[PDB]
Amino acid sequence: GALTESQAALVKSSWEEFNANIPKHTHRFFILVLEIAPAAKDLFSFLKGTSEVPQNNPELQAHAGKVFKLVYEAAIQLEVTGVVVTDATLKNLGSVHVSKGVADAHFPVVKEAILKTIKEVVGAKWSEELNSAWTIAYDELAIVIKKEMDDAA
């Protein structure tokens, strides 16, 4: 629905449920990233050097917390305004990803890990409409971040 108010409402409620247990869901998210692309471990300071994904690391928690909140806020923004607006936070973001060695081809990795995270968080409440809602917000945000990366470089 390239975000109907009911699509927006679902992203908000699944985000709230996400954010109710940051320790568990952010740990789950990084397991899912490494299962999809084990080589991505090396990109994160808080991981590189560990055996298993840490369970009580505040840097891991703060980073995965920010990533999910920005997709959520992009979903509201698309629904309200019809676009994802660039800003200071997203151009700064463009600059940190270039520094960290994040490339365009990494985006599908974090997309699949997010969809799989959200499916586990909501359990039986999962729907095709929820999945298509997170998908659209992620893709539209990703477009705008990829631009800034292009531009940061």
Q: Which residues are annotated as a binding site for O2?
A: 63
Provide the minimum distance between the beta carbon of 48 and ligand HEM in the complex, in angstroms, as a whole number.
9
Q: Determine the distance from the C-alpha atom of residue 143 to the mean position of all C-alpha atoms in its chain, rounded to a whole number.
A: 13
CB of 150 to ligand HEM, least distance (A): 14
Return residues touching ligand HEM (CB under 6 A): 40, 43-45, 63, 66-67, 70-71, 93, 96-97, 100, 102, 106-107, 109-110, 138, 141-142, 145
Chain interruptions in the chain, by residue before each (C–N > 2.5 Å): none
Closest CB to ligand HEM among residues 50, 125: 50
> Which residue, 105 or 124, is less far from ligand HEM as judged by CB?
105
Contact 113, 45 (CB under 8 A): no
Nearest CA-CA partner of 80 in 8, 153, 14? 8
- Nearest approach, Cβ of 119 to ligand HEM (angstroms)? 18
Q: Where are the beta strands (DSSP E) in the chain?
A: none
Of 2 and 123, nearer to ligand HEM (C-beta) is: 2
Contact (Cβ atoms closer than 8 angstroms) between residue 15 and residue 68: yes
